[PDB]
Design an enzyme around this catalytic site. Structure first.
Site, PDB file in Angstrom:
ATOM      1  N   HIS E   8       0.814  -1.181  -0.004  1.00  0.00           N
ATOM      2  CA  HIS E   8       0.015   0.036   0.020  1.00  0.00           C
ATOM      3  C   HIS E   8       0.632   1.138  -0.086  1.00  0.00           C
ATOM      4  O   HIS E   8       0.581   2.033  -0.931  1.00  0.00           O
ATOM      5  CB  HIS E   8      -0.890   0.153   1.487  1.00  0.00           C
ATOM      6  CG  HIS E   8      -2.064  -1.107   1.020  1.00  0.00           C
ATOM      7  ND1 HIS E   8      -1.640  -2.369   1.934  1.00  0.00           N
ATOM      8  CD2 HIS E   8      -3.118  -1.134   0.736  1.00  0.00           C
ATOM      9  CE1 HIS E   8      -2.875  -3.187   1.629  1.00  0.00           C
ATOM     10  NE2 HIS E   8      -3.813  -2.405   0.904  1.00  0.00           N
ATOM     11  N   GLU E  80       2.992  -2.093   7.615  1.00  0.00           N
ATOM     12  CA  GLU E  80       3.928  -1.902   6.354  1.00  0.00           C
ATOM     13  C   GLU E  80       5.138  -1.184   6.625  1.00  0.00           C
ATOM     14  O   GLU E  80       6.037  -1.256   6.073  1.00  0.00           O
ATOM     15  CB  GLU E  80       2.987  -1.264   4.912  1.00  0.00           C
ATOM     16  CG  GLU E  80       2.199  -2.433   4.477  1.00  0.00           C
ATOM     17  CD  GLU E  80       1.711  -1.945   3.254  1.00  0.00           C
ATOM     18  OE1 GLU E  80       2.257  -0.945   2.693  1.00  0.00           O
ATOM     19  OE2 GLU E  80       0.535  -2.528   2.865  1.00  0.00           O
ATOM     20  N   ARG E 168     -23.178  10.032  19.403  1.00  0.00           N
ATOM     21  CA  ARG E 168     -23.653  11.483  18.767  1.00  0.00           C
ATOM     22  C   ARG E 168     -25.032  10.906  18.278  1.00  0.00           C
ATOM     23  O   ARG E 168     -25.031  10.021  17.421  1.00  0.00           O
ATOM     24  CB  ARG E 168     -22.798  11.655  17.471  1.00  0.00           C
ATOM     25  CG  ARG E 168     -21.459  12.404  17.992  1.00  0.00           C
ATOM     26  CD  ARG E 168     -20.525  12.948  16.878  1.00  0.00           C
ATOM     27  NE  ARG E 168     -19.667  14.229  17.231  1.00  0.00           N
ATOM     28  CZ  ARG E 168     -18.447  13.814  17.428  1.00  0.00           C
ATOM     29  NH1 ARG E 168     -17.758  12.590  17.356  1.00  0.00           N
ATOM     30  NH2 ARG E 168     -17.524  14.906  17.894  1.00  0.00           N
ATOM     31  N   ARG E 223     -17.242  17.614  24.519  1.00  0.00           N
ATOM     32  CA  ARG E 223     -18.627  17.157  24.345  1.00  0.00           C
ATOM     33  C   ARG E 223     -19.813  17.393  25.481  1.00  0.00           C
ATOM     34  O   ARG E 223     -20.793  17.023  25.515  1.00  0.00           O
ATOM     35  CB  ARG E 223     -18.562  15.693  24.187  1.00  0.00           C
ATOM     36  CG  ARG E 223     -17.750  14.871  22.913  1.00  0.00           C
ATOM     37  CD  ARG E 223     -18.751  14.995  21.638  1.00  0.00           C
ATOM     38  NE  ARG E 223     -19.961  14.768  21.925  1.00  0.00           N
ATOM     39  CZ  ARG E 223     -20.211  13.372  21.734  1.00  0.00           C
ATOM     40  NH1 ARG E 223     -19.040  12.605  21.221  1.00  0.00           N
ATOM     41  NH2 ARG E 223     -21.206  12.720  21.695  1.00  0.00           N
TER      42      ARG E 223
HETATM   43  O1  LIG Z   1     -14.837  14.013  18.551  1.00  0.00           O
HETATM   44  C1  LIG Z   1     -14.047  13.464  18.009  1.00  0.00           C
HETATM   45  C2  LIG Z   1     -12.956  14.488  17.398  1.00  0.00           C
HETATM   46  C3  LIG Z   1     -11.885  14.020  16.731  1.00  0.00           C
HETATM   47  N1  LIG Z   1     -11.779  12.543  16.356  1.00  0.00           N
HETATM   48  C4  LIG Z   1     -10.668  12.197  15.343  1.00  0.00           C
HETATM   49  O2  LIG Z   1     -10.827  12.795  14.167  1.00  0.00           O
HETATM   50  C5  LIG Z   1     -10.670  11.845  13.100  1.00  0.00           C
HETATM   51  C6  LIG Z   1     -12.189  11.871  12.365  1.00  0.00           C
HETATM   52  O3  LIG Z   1     -12.456  13.334  12.438  1.00  0.00           O
HETATM   53  C7  LIG Z   1     -10.805  10.485  13.873  1.00  0.00           C
HETATM   54  O4  LIG Z   1      -9.372   9.937  13.273  1.00  0.00           O
HETATM   55  C8  LIG Z   1     -10.561  10.621  15.152  1.00  0.00           C
HETATM   56  O5  LIG Z   1      -9.446  10.111  15.787  1.00  0.00           O
HETATM   57  C9  LIG Z   1     -12.934  11.679  16.761  1.00  0.00           C
HETATM   58  O6  LIG Z   1     -12.915  10.626  16.696  1.00  0.00           O
HETATM   59  N2  LIG Z   1     -13.928  12.290  17.517  1.00  0.00           N
HETATM   60  O1  LIG Z   2      -6.836  -9.577  -0.494  1.00  0.00           O
HETATM   61  C1  LIG Z   2      -7.440  -8.525  -0.699  1.00  0.00           C
HETATM   62  C2  LIG Z   2      -7.530  -7.817  -1.744  1.00  0.00           C
HETATM   63  C3  LIG Z   2      -8.111  -6.508  -1.637  1.00  0.00           C
HETATM   64  N1  LIG Z   2      -8.782  -5.905  -0.475  1.00  0.00           N
HETATM   65  C4  LIG Z   2      -9.190  -4.673  -0.492  1.00  0.00           C
HETATM   66  O2  LIG Z   2      -8.177  -3.649  -0.836  1.00  0.00           O
HETATM   67  C5  LIG Z   2      -8.357  -2.514  -0.027  1.00  0.00           C
HETATM   68  C6  LIG Z   2      -6.994  -2.362   0.857  1.00  0.00           C
HETATM   69  O3  LIG Z   2      -6.181  -2.501  -0.119  1.00  0.00           O
HETATM   70  C7  LIG Z   2      -9.628  -2.752   0.766  1.00  0.00           C
HETATM   71  O4  LIG Z   2     -10.574  -1.737   0.598  1.00  0.00           O
HETATM   72  C8  LIG Z   2      -9.826  -4.106   0.396  1.00  0.00           C
HETATM   73  O5  LIG Z   2     -11.536  -4.123   0.154  1.00  0.00           O
HETATM   74  C9  LIG Z   2      -8.445  -6.799   0.559  1.00  0.00           C
HETATM   75  O6  LIG Z   2      -9.001  -6.405   1.885  1.00  0.00           O
HETATM   76  N2  LIG Z   2      -8.186  -7.999   0.628  1.00  0.00           N
END
Ligand SMILES: O=c1ccn([C@@H]2O[C@H](CO)[C@@H](O)[C@H]2O)c(=O)[nH]1
Ligand SMILES: O=c1ccn([C@@H]2O[C@H](CO)[C@@H](O)[C@H]2O)c(=O)[nH]1
Ligand SMILES: O=c1ccn([C@@H]2O[C@H](CO)[C@@H](O)[C@H]2O)c(=O)[nH]1
Ligand SMILES: O=c1ccn([C@@H]2O[C@H](CO)[C@@H](O)[C@H]2O)c(=O)[nH]1
Ligand SMILES: O=c1ccn([C@@H]2O[C@H](CO)[C@@H](O)[C@H]2O)c(=O)[nH]1
Ligand SMILES: O=c1ccn([C@@H]2O[C@H](CO)[C@@H](O)[C@H]2O)c(=O)[nH]1
Lengths: 243, 244, 242, 242, 253, 242
Positions: E8, E80, E168, E223
């Site tokens: 990836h 990775e 939420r 919150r």
């Molecule tokens: O109330 C909150 C504020 C921030 N995030 C963070 O913001 C990202 C999505 O907005 C996520 O990776 C998460 O870690 C939350 O999940 N909740």
């Molecule tokens: O063996 C596999 C091949 C592809 N993906 C897809 O590839 C993306 C991550 O590379 C994901 O959205 C998933 O749906 C897998 O999860 N497994």
């Protein structure tokens, strides 16, 4: 010289004994053996105090377990290694039913597994059931000494406070799993709360070991000293019918 | 009619407090006819119900069908009608080498390998038989001198995979149950059957007295005669007398 | 007489103490207390022997918990009722890692909850984690006296035998859940087996209390003085948390 | 007999690979009578079996009885005998205010509130009907012009507490199912019944094709207990899967 | 395989130049901003939600690589990078605090997480603690003192959803599944500091594989409070938490 | 500027659209959208790239979800907030069956829920089932474009590696739960591994939204472990549901 890790006992110390009365409190061990022939102190380590007695010529062990499943599971296992096949648990309990009074004696058929240690012997699917002969002996001895006895299901908790839904605590909080849990166990016909039966009953029932459970009511949630000795006489009398 | 499935009114029981509950609708009349004044009441779906009398007190014989689900219907509706005590007679598969085909097994408590029991109590709650009922069953077996074993029963929601049977269409047993028979054996479980977990749980959690008895039809350590059925039947009826 | 059901203690007996060193063995209490100023015996009931001592003119508590989370939950709870906000546990452990040897000191960051009592305080998703300040005080106290220390995850079991995957027992069997368990905690980097940290750490972290855990290695599992080093560390840690 | 419960041989099937499977044994004949050359095969316990002919093809009608266990016996033993396609026809309880008594409900997949399904696949696995079997049922329903709703079905191991019925002996429902019907309703679940979860899971994870169809006999937003378009559809659907 | 040692991230062991620490933000756009607090930063690759940069800190090579939102994409990034040679992961994120005493702009360091995620279970069962590495947490706390932030140290709730898992109700549905109904209150009483979405996965998979992992986040919303911060909700809250994660990394090279 | 928190879109931006194609790769959004009429770029924030397009003169959205349930749950929720009621996922997949090929198109009826986000919408008993109409159009579109299509169950993992039982990993080890899980899914007739369907289908089925799931096989896992029909199919399927 010891054979086991905790109890500080040899197989020879049991002197052929195959049955053990397992109270919770080290200080209650001697009082029980006193009701029997030729009592002698075997050993005392941690919360595991052990005495040897005699009943109709055959040797019996009285050995404390301590509070909770884990400590109990150490004692039962090591006593089993030593030759004990039959375990009789005497203890104290808090009734959750209005009709059960302080003074009444409770024989447990099976227990609600609100512990951790039972899962180390059998999956939750498995019933924490007492041995039939042990329970029969506990009840027929209870009827024979004229005790007000109730036979049924016990809730066995890993905590004294939240798991038995006590609110007068440091936090005053009870985790979701246990909020309104007592009202549920009451509705299900559960008689009482204690802390050691689930572990004892599961680990014995799933290892070809025979276990019984008797306890005297100390507190009643919904609502003396001669109370105790009834359950003590019973657990000693029941032993005779099991040797 | 008072109840949705059994097609029975409270009056059809006329005072009956106890019900012998087999699995097979065909096994019902045969049991009811070991008692006084056996009268057929109704028959709907897998629930076949008869009324007999035992020492001048009315008794019900009512089939549950196979599995916990249908047991949970028959029991619930008999309870609505006034039955407070249930005695299940069944057939069973021994998993212990010392238990022979023909023997009688009295279940103290059941390994809950089912789903229906969870609708009455969470998994922590024991699937334990009523003490008085177990005593009646054991003493009934003692009197007629049958080979009796008293212990834990594995109660599955399936005849095949849940009891680790491989002579199936797929020949597959899901991870949870693969190697599970060897596990129940080591734990001192006597037998497989398909109802006790549900019956014993739903009764012990609602104030109802329940007992479980079964004749061994097979020994699982071998593969996967007729005095087996009538021996457990004589016991379940003899026990009934003592809980009236 | 007593403000708590089990311990046989009053708020007064603590004399304003907020920190408790909580050993497993009652026998260990007096020893730990004797490394401090003005050590005095308080009470002894069931598996709970309690002493009060002093450090830099501050009241400290030493109180045993017994074996397992159940009795540990009683001590910690009733000490919390009397004023204790910081709990330092000292214990003994069997190391499951190859390169952790007998005599080594182990500071627990967090614990694998193989217990029941913790679920009475928080669901399984909640971490059985030590307080950071306590852990800091423990590691820093460990390094200042020169002891071989390891900082990581502890497997905390409700049994000494099947849960710690000992087959050397009466039945010789270990329940499926735990069969091959030690070999799995090994690859995950879990250091050791003990019986209390899961309960202690969960009930403090979810109830706004501070907890830390230190233990000396008495057994190495991949196989089959020590005491005083962890004891010195736990007192030196306590000193830094007043 | 080749199978333990059904009392049938592969020859009784006459090359039949499809089984219409009702719950009620007393309803087997009625279904078979709506087809060509209906011949009673066997009747044991809750399992009554009839062979029928349809577009000149052998088709089995065999009852399952109430519940997953009794069904898991019938399906397995019919699968041993040669059946590869299973169509369930039964009765159901609607939990949506707008589903009328008499409506036909086609299930795409089921809420696994049963036990037997876990004996074939872990809870993660979806209790999903076969696509071809589901299509056949929907297309059949749309061809006869029945009022039809397609969606998820809650499949409970009990008739009462698992379907949140309160007019029971005790009048109580376990914590898990307390307010469970409202949740299923909010999620757009159509109905309650007792067999589909087991049927759909055991089939979809064993290379067997299964469809699910039921007739509404009670609306749960109104009553707990009540005071054949479904049947024609299951036959016509079978006609298209032969 | 267009010159990549991994599937990836699109990176090679060479791209890293022996870098053994990786700062792991959630947002691909934040990666350049973080590398800009260090010496000789250079863009390495950008595929899917994974944007990676290499920079130098006190002379030594360091990776900044985005994870994307959630455990699944984080587990890919962490795995990775670990193949490439990374042994220490410091996550810098945004968070919503649930305690009344924690204000917006405050900096939170996670000791361990409440596992409301699914990916953590792919590395260890639910009983295993989602704990951070000791040295990583020590580094962050000290770095917070160096920057001079208002810092809280404790438990974080790590959720697999932004909405119902963080209770939420302001959603299309308006309903919350039984599991999370009244959950925030329960976490509050349990002293949980905040909600975010990646920590539980990161902390579990690192602690269960001999990898060191830290977790720091800046509070961008409370919150329980009524007033919600202005246009620069992140802009200078980021500047505090980002300045700390970089400072913490200095003491882990 | 934006009615939603993440996608950076207003209800107006969608131009009345009610169906969204939801790819997992933000870079593939443009390509997919390029197959329709009037393709206008709307926004790119984080892993969420959103285009608007026109199909038979009816507005359609193409929005990326990123990898995994969490990121998907946000996109779906926020697209749902802006008016979208129908979601069509187009991803890449790893086949776990011997007969399925690299290049083959896989249409999901329902998914094995090896994820966590789905549990934030329904309990595990609830099935991760695709919408009946959505699946129908996808299978029908599959015939139209003409490709080797398989319809059935998908295993939806929260990890690319251990949850899909991959061993080309840093540790080379897989947690008990997933050790030997791939062949287990094989015997159950599961077609493939992917990472988003369990969350998508669960959150749509339990919230009254229509969801469809199609994928293109890029690897067969019985043979190896690593490295447009599906695109055309998901576009043609959209035409049938507008
Ligand atoms: O109330 C909150 C504020 C921030 N995030 C963070 O913001 C990202 C999505 O907005 C996520 O990776 C998460 O870690 C939350 O999940 N909740
Ligand atoms: O063996 C596999 C091949 C592809 N993906 C897809 O590839 C993306 C991550 O590379 C994901 O959205 C998933 O749906 C897998 O999860 N497994
Ligand atoms: O309501 C009660 C009454 C008694 N005990 C007993 O008290 C001991 C703990 O003090 C335990 O061993 C238990 O058996 C309880 O736990 N709860
Ligand atoms: O090995 C056996 C033998 C008998 N039964 C009984 O037979 C019935 C179904 O065949 C069930 O109700 C059960 O009581 C089994 O389940 N398993
Ligand atoms: O391998 C070990 C070594 C020590 N202990 C400790 O020994 C005590 C029981 O003797 C428990 O409290 C526990 O902390 C273990 O549980 N396991
Ligand atoms: O509300 C209803 C209506 C019908 N059934 C079906 O009727 C039979 C038992 O009443 C079972 O097969 C079950 O699926 C229910 O479970 N609930």
């Amino acid at each position: 010289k010891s054979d086991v890790f905790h109890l500080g006992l040899t197989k020879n110390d049991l002197q052929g004994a195959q049955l053990a009365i397992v109270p919770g409190d080290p200080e209650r061990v001697e009082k029980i053996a006193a009701l029997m022939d030729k009592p002698v102190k075997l050993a005392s380590h941690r919360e595991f105090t052990s005495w040897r007695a005699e009943l109709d010529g055959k040797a019996v062990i009285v050995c404390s377990t301590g509070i909770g499943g884990p400590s109990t599971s150490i004692a039962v296992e090591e006593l089993a290694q030593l030759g004990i096949r039959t375990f009789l648990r005497i203890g104290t309990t808090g009734a959750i039913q209005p009709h059960i009074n302080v003074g009444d004696v409770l024989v447990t058929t099976a227990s609600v597994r609100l512990d951790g240690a039972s899962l180390h012997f059998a999956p939750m699917e498995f019933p924490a059931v007492a041995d039939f002969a042990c329970t029969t002996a506990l009840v027929e001895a209870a009827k024979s000494i004229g005790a007000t006895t109730h036979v049924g299901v016990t809730a066995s908790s890993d905590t004294f406070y939240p798991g038995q839904e006590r609110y007068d605590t440091y936090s005053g909080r009870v985790v979701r799993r246990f909020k309104g849990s007592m009202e549920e166990w009451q509705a299900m016909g559960v008689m009482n709360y204690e802390m050691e039966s689930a572990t004892l009953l599961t680990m014995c029932a799933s290892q070809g070991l025979r276990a019984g459970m008797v306890a005297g009511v100390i507190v009643n949630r919904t609502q003396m000293k001669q109370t105790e000795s009834h359950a003590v006489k019973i657990v000693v009398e029941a032993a005779r019918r099991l040797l």
